[PDB]
Each structure stands twice: as C-alpha cells, then as structure tokens.
Amino acid sequence: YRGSIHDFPGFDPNQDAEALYTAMKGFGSDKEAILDIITSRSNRQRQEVCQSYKSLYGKDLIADLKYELTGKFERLIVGLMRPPAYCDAKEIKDAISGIGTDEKCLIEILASRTNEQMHQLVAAYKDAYERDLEADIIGDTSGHFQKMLVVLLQGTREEDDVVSEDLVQQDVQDLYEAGELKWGTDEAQFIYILGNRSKQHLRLVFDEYLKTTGKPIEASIRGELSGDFEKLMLAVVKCIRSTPEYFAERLFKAMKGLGTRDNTLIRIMVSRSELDMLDIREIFRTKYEKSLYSMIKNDTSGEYKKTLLKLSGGDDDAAGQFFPEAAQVAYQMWELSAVARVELKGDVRPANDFNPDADAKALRKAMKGLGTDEDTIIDIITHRSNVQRQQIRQTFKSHFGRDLMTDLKSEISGDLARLILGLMMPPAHYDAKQLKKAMEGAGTDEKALIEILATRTNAEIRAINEAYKEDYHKSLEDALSSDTSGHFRRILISLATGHREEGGENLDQAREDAQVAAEILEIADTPSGDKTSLETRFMTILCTRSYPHLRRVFQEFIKMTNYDVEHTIKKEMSGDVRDAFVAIVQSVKNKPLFFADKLYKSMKGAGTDDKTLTRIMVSRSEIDLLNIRREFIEKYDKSLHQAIEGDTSGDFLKALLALCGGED
Ligand SMILES: [Ca+2]
Ligand SMILES: [Ca+2]
Ligand SMILES: [Ca+2]
Ligand SMILES: [Ca+2]
Ligand SMILES: [Ca+2]
C-alpha cells in the first residue's frame, strides 16, 4: 500500500456521524474535530459515515458541511467526502464549465487515469450531470489535442503482460521516424503508440529509445509539436514513466512562488491520497530538496493547511530508504545524465559583419559628452561575443588612446555597470574577479565560492589560476587559505587545483567509492551516534573523481544502500560542507539545471540577489544559458525572461533581456 490515508483505522460510521453532528452543534463548528475525523477515515469509510449521518439525523452530512465550512477548507473537506470517480467528474465538469477551459486540469486527469478509473469517471459523470463526458470534451477541445483526449478517454490501453521484444523494437523505430527523422512530428503515430500500448511496453520502449538514440523520447517531442497538444503528450510520457513523479511535479508547480494554485493542490492531495501519495512524497524530496509537507506548510494556513498536511504525512519515521517507484526515478535521473547526448548552447553568438571600428566609434560617441547613451552601449555589448568584445577594446584604445573599460566605469553605474563591465572581461579573468570579491572584505561569500569551484572545468580552473595570479599577484590556493579555513578550505582548495580526473568510468572502483559513501552516511548499530563522516576518502572522491565515473558511483550507491547520495549528504553533513558536496553532485548530475535553480533562487522571495543573477548570466552567456533556460522553464513553469522581467527594472532589465535567450 502506497496511499497516505491509512487503510482504515478500526471504526464504526455511527460514532463518526455523532461526532461530526456534535462538532456542528451550537454556534460555529469544531473544525479541528471535523478535519481530524474526516482525514483519518478512508474514502470508503467516509461514504458509510455519510450513510449513517443520514439515517440518524435525516440530513445530508455534506450539505451540513457546506453550511458550516467556507472557502478552501470547505472545498477540500467536501472534496474528501465524495467518491473518487464522482470527484474526478466534478473537476472535469468545472474544467469544462465557464467560457475559459482549464486545459491543465484536463491533461492531468486524462493523462494519469488508468483504463478502469477512466470508465468510472465517464460513468459517474453520466450519473452526476446526466450527460456524455466524451461529447462535452469534444465540445470544448480542438485538434490533435482533442484527438488524444478522446483516445485516452476510451480506457482501452493494452494490458501489462505479453512483452513482444520485437514490437518494442518496432515502436522505437516507428517513433524515431515519426519524430527525430523529420521536420515536425507525425502526431497520428504518436497518438496511436502512446495511447494504446500498455504502460509496461511503453516504458520498455522509452528505454530502448534512450539507449538506441542518444536522447530521451521527450527530447524528440519537446518543441516539435505545438500548443496544449505538446503539453498533453509530454504529460502522458511522464505518466507512463511515472505518474507519481508527474504529480510530484504538478504539486511543486502549484506552489511555485507567490501564491498557490489551490484548486490543483486540492485535486491532487485528495485524488492521490489513497493511491501513491507516499511515492509522490519520496520523489518530491529527491527533486526539490524540501518536503512536499514543508511546502504545503509554508504556502497555506488555518485548518485548510491542517488538512493538506494530513493528506500527505511528513515525518513518518524520518527519511528512510527508497521504495521501488522513487528508486527507479532516482536511478533513472543518473542513467539519463550519464548517457544522454546533449548539445550545450549559449545565447550570445558572434555578430555577423562584425566591424570593431564601427562599434568602437559608436561606443565612444555614446559616451562622448555630458550625457550617456545606455541603449547604444547595452545593444552593442550584449550582442557581441566575448572574443569580439576584446577586439572592440583593442580597437577603442587604438582609436582614442583611452581604455574602454575605464570610460565605461565612468559613463554607467549600478547593476548595469556591474553587468556591462562583466561582459567586457575575458572569461578566466571574470571568474578570478568574482572569486576575488568573495574573499575580499569582511566575511566570505561562500555561496559564490562553491558556485564557481564546483562548477568550472579543469581547463577553466587552470586559466582562473593564472588569471588570478596575474590580476592580483598571488595564487588562488593561498588567497583561499587566508579568507577561509576548516573543512571548507580543504574542499575548496582541492577543486581549485583543477586536476580532477578526466578518465572514463570503471565499475569495480565505482562500487568501492559508493561503499565509503554508504559508510559516510549509514551509521546505525552501536555507532548509532552520528560519527560525522569517514575520512578524507569521501572528499577525494567527490573532488577528484571524473563526472562520468561519479554518475556510476551514485548509480551503484542507489542499488546498494537504498538512498540517493544527495539526500544522505544533507543528512550527515551541514552548512558550507554539505552545500559544497551537494553543488558538486548537482554539477555532475545536471549542470544546466544547477544554474537554473540558482537563478530561480536569486529572484525568489523579497528582493533580488542582483549579484548572483548577473554572475550566472555573464559566465554562462556563451556556454549553456539556452540549456539553462530550457531547464528553468521546465521546472518553474515560468520562462527565465518572465522572471527577470518581474524582478528587475531600468537599463539593467534592458541589458539582462538583451543577453537572455529568446523569451521561451
Ligand atoms: Ca453549529
Ligand atoms: Ca506559492
Ligand atoms: Ca557621458
Ligand atoms: Ca573577505
Ligand atoms: Ca524577488
């Protein structure tokens, strides 16, 4: 059983009907009591309580509940009192009701329900509103989208069993030629393969595709379809592979940032409460490093909150090892990171017809005088590669006998100046400066230290070292030594050597590495007391092993000690040490995703971490910023463009957009 709401307690409907009637007596009502009663009884039990409440007081419990309760709490409670099928039927009903259509709700349900759930959905809709749900959906939908919904609606997907190795091989071929191999995608073929084959088969097919092709099936889909249809197809894919991970995602997006998408929050927490909430919880904590529970807590309030938390659970015997579903998703994130062929692309490309003489002039004319023309500067610099900017710098000083850097630092100011000068600096020097500004001054800007050092490559590090010695007349190691100390200094200096192995995998050694990991974390038995960590062995592995090899270690680690390394590190480790290793891990797992996260974080909450924003935007400008934006939009349901637009203003907002890739 993977449902959160315990499979029944040992009740009697009559005692609850009396307890609930009681809670609703007098002025007001005992919300805590109603909440505690209804959220600790399974749905079946709740149907009986309804039956009892009816025979004892001759009334409708739900009606009485709608009377005493209001708002989110009302909705949620009542939502919990209706049978699953009747539940889905009103969500779809309401999704279709009104002029606007909630396509997100439609997708989530039609993409996640099994053949049987589908049948009971249709049947309940027929009884509740006395109407055909298929005609209603066709009446509110259009195109390939409506086609796929209608197919999913039939509830006739092949059963899981007879695995035709050959048919799997065939569907991979058909899917590859219907997509990757042509401009656009054969929608029809995808609607047929993904809508009829069993979930079992489709999984086997997605794996063969990823292995046979250098990419996941989704990579061939994303950006090759259009509108709601793309979103829909992407959702059946995620559901086939893992519906619990899908809901884990939908849950995260409903609480993204300012505000909540309550209705969705209600739909999921309730509908999945007796199916796979526990699985959802596990996956959620592996992809968001923050309880489903914690986020439900910090984004809701009152008895409404109370209930949601109940429907989830968030302390049932601490963390504990993975269950099948989550272990697969975890294992697969690594597999993917390990074998996927990905094109790393930046957003700033060399300008064509590049004329340094023309730019150098324009830049000067834009500054020459009392005023100062920001647009010319911003528009020129942001749209010119770094290599091209150095040329402009040489040409500028040759034409006017004055340094372009010095003039710019004079004509512009604020966040813009930090961003413009930043672009103007050669890469190895820019990071050297940032490293310099994280140690220079009182205290240490740890975050910026980890970011740079757990992220840059050997070639980049060797360069940063020289760039550093040349600009500040000192080595990077020693500069590190002064500003920091303890374990943090050690890991920071190891990484900064830029000697990390660049060699291939190696199974045997991976298992040995993971073993020390298992030890570093798992410390039960008599040494139950957290004996912290196990030697410098762990640090050497995370700091000096090759990325391809680490992905192996982390994969074997999961096979072995049933946890994910990132999880356990947060366990036995803390502060700058915990954070340094986690950054390392995330860097090898999905570097682009790591920068996306940091961006989200820098504009999340109260104000803006203007420094982190530009550091990333500048240094990733010509590497993987496009990949970054792809990840960003995927995980945060919002484009990088929109985020920047709502967190910054002025010319800074101007220069930032001009640097950022194509909206999204
Ligand atoms: Ca009352
Ligand atoms: Ca929110
Ligand atoms: Ca001026
Ligand atoms: Ca300092
Ligand atoms: Ca903000």
XYZ file of all heavy atoms in Angstrom, residues 256 596 599-604 608 613 632-633 636-649 653 656-657 660 663:
248
model
N 4.780 26.974 -6.705
C 5.943 27.649 -7.280
C 6.471 28.799 -6.427
O 7.470 28.649 -5.720
C 5.580 28.176 -8.672
C 6.732 28.763 -9.475
C 6.204 29.588 -10.650
C 5.189 28.814 -11.485
N 4.590 29.656 -12.563
N 20.022 26.974 -13.354
C 18.623 27.389 -13.428
C 18.111 27.631 -12.007
O 17.525 28.686 -11.705
C 17.786 26.317 -14.103
N 19.348 30.674 -10.365
C 18.699 31.854 -10.894
C 17.343 31.997 -10.207
O 16.983 33.071 -9.707
C 18.517 31.727 -12.408
C 19.812 31.859 -13.220
C 19.575 31.587 -14.725
C 20.365 33.266 -12.986
N 16.580 30.913 -10.166
C 15.273 30.996 -9.531
C 15.412 31.543 -8.119
O 14.667 32.421 -7.707
C 14.591 29.629 -9.490
C 13.197 29.688 -8.928
C 12.133 30.078 -9.722
C 12.940 29.372 -7.596
C 10.847 30.153 -9.213
C 11.653 29.444 -7.073
C 10.612 29.835 -7.891
O 9.322 29.915 -7.404
N 16.385 31.019 -7.391
C 16.634 31.418 -6.019
C 16.993 32.893 -5.848
O 16.573 33.521 -4.890
C 17.743 30.534 -5.450
C 18.108 30.800 -4.016
C 18.965 29.661 -3.492
C 19.547 29.985 -2.123
N 20.418 28.888 -1.623
N 17.745 33.447 -6.792
C 18.180 34.836 -6.713
C 17.086 35.873 -6.907
O 17.283 37.045 -6.585
C 19.302 35.095 -7.725
O 18.808 35.111 -9.055
N 15.942 35.455 -7.439
C 14.818 36.370 -7.676
C 13.577 35.926 -6.914
O 12.496 36.451 -7.135
C 14.456 36.413 -9.166
C 15.577 36.811 -10.094
S 15.056 36.742 -11.826
C 14.986 34.968 -12.088
N 13.738 34.962 -6.016
C 12.620 34.404 -5.262
C 12.474 35.015 -3.880
O 13.451 35.130 -3.142
C 12.821 32.890 -5.140
C 11.764 32.147 -4.350
C 12.350 30.871 -3.739
C 13.257 31.156 -2.527
N 14.399 32.082 -2.813
N 16.003 41.055 -4.734
C 16.775 40.329 -5.731
C 18.239 40.216 -5.344
O 18.832 41.142 -4.795
C 16.717 41.016 -7.113
O 15.356 41.293 -7.466
C 17.325 40.116 -8.173
N 22.507 36.758 -9.966
C 21.823 36.849 -11.247
C 22.793 37.144 -12.397
O 22.854 36.386 -13.370
C 20.754 37.944 -11.169
C 19.939 38.269 -12.417
C 19.321 36.998 -12.993
C 18.863 39.282 -12.056
N 15.052 25.801 -16.679
C 14.336 26.784 -15.891
C 12.853 26.682 -16.133
O 12.074 26.423 -15.213
C 14.789 28.198 -16.252
C 14.309 29.243 -15.292
C 15.075 29.596 -14.194
C 13.084 29.878 -15.490
C 14.634 30.576 -13.305
C 12.628 30.861 -14.606
C 13.404 31.213 -13.513
N 12.475 26.907 -17.386
C 11.085 26.884 -17.805
C 10.432 25.542 -17.460
O 9.302 25.514 -16.998
C 10.995 27.200 -19.342
C 9.623 27.798 -19.700
C 11.287 25.966 -20.151
C 8.446 26.896 -19.435
N 10.201 25.427 -13.363
C 9.485 26.523 -12.730
C 8.255 27.041 -13.453
O 7.744 28.100 -13.119
C 10.467 27.664 -12.426
C 11.559 27.231 -11.458
C 12.875 27.059 -11.891
C 11.254 26.911 -10.129
C 13.859 26.572 -11.033
C 12.223 26.423 -9.270
C 13.529 26.251 -9.728
O 14.493 25.735 -8.891
N 7.777 26.291 -14.440
C 6.570 26.664 -15.161
C 6.575 28.126 -15.582
O 5.527 28.695 -15.877
C 5.367 26.412 -14.256
C 4.121 26.078 -15.023
O 4.240 25.560 -16.149
O 3.021 26.318 -14.484
N 7.756 28.734 -15.609
C 7.886 30.140 -15.974
C 9.192 30.322 -16.726
O 10.204 29.734 -16.347
C 7.902 30.975 -14.702
C 8.048 32.471 -14.885
C 8.210 33.146 -13.516
C 7.076 32.770 -12.564
N 7.304 33.244 -11.168
N 9.182 31.128 -17.786
C 10.402 31.349 -18.564
C 11.398 32.241 -17.815
O 11.013 33.031 -16.952
C 10.073 31.982 -19.913
O 9.516 33.264 -19.731
N 12.680 32.110 -18.130
C 13.671 32.939 -17.467
C 13.362 34.416 -17.730
O 13.551 35.272 -16.856
C 15.067 32.605 -17.979
C 16.140 33.572 -17.503
C 16.089 33.689 -15.975
C 17.493 33.081 -17.977
N 12.876 34.679 -18.946
C 12.505 36.007 -19.431
C 11.470 36.671 -18.525
O 11.638 37.824 -18.118
C 11.936 35.885 -20.847
C 11.743 37.196 -21.541
N 12.694 37.743 -22.380
C 10.722 38.087 -21.500
C 12.267 38.913 -22.822
N 11.075 39.146 -22.304
N 10.400 35.938 -18.210
C 9.334 36.457 -17.344
C 9.829 36.747 -15.925
O 9.433 37.735 -15.298
C 8.180 35.459 -17.251
C 7.437 35.213 -18.537
C 6.375 34.147 -18.375
O 6.677 33.003 -18.032
N 5.122 34.515 -18.617
N 10.688 35.869 -15.421
C 11.220 36.022 -14.078
C 12.051 37.289 -13.988
O 11.859 38.100 -13.077
C 12.062 34.803 -13.700
N 12.966 37.469 -14.937
C 13.814 38.653 -14.938
C 12.942 39.915 -15.074
O 13.153 40.905 -14.370
C 14.869 38.575 -16.096
C 15.772 37.351 -15.883
C 15.727 39.851 -16.142
C 16.810 37.140 -16.961
N 11.943 39.856 -15.956
C 11.051 40.993 -16.193
C 10.273 41.425 -14.957
O 9.920 42.595 -14.815
C 10.071 40.659 -17.320
C 9.410 41.863 -17.976
C 8.826 41.521 -19.338
O 8.723 40.315 -19.657
O 8.470 42.453 -20.090
N 10.012 40.490 -14.051
C 9.265 40.838 -12.855
C 10.100 41.153 -11.629
O 9.557 41.561 -10.605
N 11.416 40.982 -11.732
C 12.327 41.222 -10.612
C 13.291 42.378 -10.778
O 13.876 42.833 -9.801
C 13.134 39.944 -10.324
C 12.489 39.072 -9.250
O 12.710 39.346 -8.050
O 11.750 38.128 -9.612
N 13.473 42.840 -12.011
C 14.396 43.939 -12.286
C 13.773 45.052 -13.115
O 12.750 44.858 -13.779
C 15.677 43.442 -13.007
O 15.325 42.515 -14.042
C 16.607 42.774 -12.020
N 14.409 46.217 -13.077
C 13.911 47.381 -13.797
C 15.024 48.171 -14.468
O 16.187 47.796 -14.418
C 13.176 48.295 -12.824
O 14.006 48.588 -11.707
N 17.344 45.821 -16.506
C 16.302 44.944 -17.023
C 16.464 44.881 -18.538
O 16.181 43.866 -19.179
C 14.930 45.521 -16.651
C 13.667 44.691 -16.885
C 13.214 44.789 -18.326
C 13.947 43.252 -16.494
N 19.785 42.854 -19.349
C 19.541 41.462 -18.966
C 18.735 40.743 -20.038
O 19.085 39.642 -20.454
C 18.785 41.420 -17.634
C 19.342 40.642 -16.439
C 20.874 40.686 -16.360
C 18.690 41.230 -15.197
N 17.648 41.365 -20.485
C 16.822 40.766 -21.523
C 17.637 40.602 -22.804
O 17.662 39.528 -23.407
C 15.593 41.637 -21.781
C 14.322 41.289 -21.000
C 14.654 40.882 -19.569
C 13.380 42.487 -21.029
N 19.705 37.500 -22.386
C 18.909 36.297 -22.237
C 18.424 35.778 -23.587
O 18.146 36.556 -24.496
C 17.726 36.618 -21.324
S 16.651 35.257 -20.995
N 12.989 34.708 -25.367
C 11.854 34.596 -24.445
C 11.677 33.182 -23.887
O 12.220 32.863 -22.825
C 10.567 35.040 -25.151
C 9.502 35.652 -24.241
C 8.980 34.695 -23.183
O 9.747 34.346 -22.263
O 7.800 34.294 -23.271
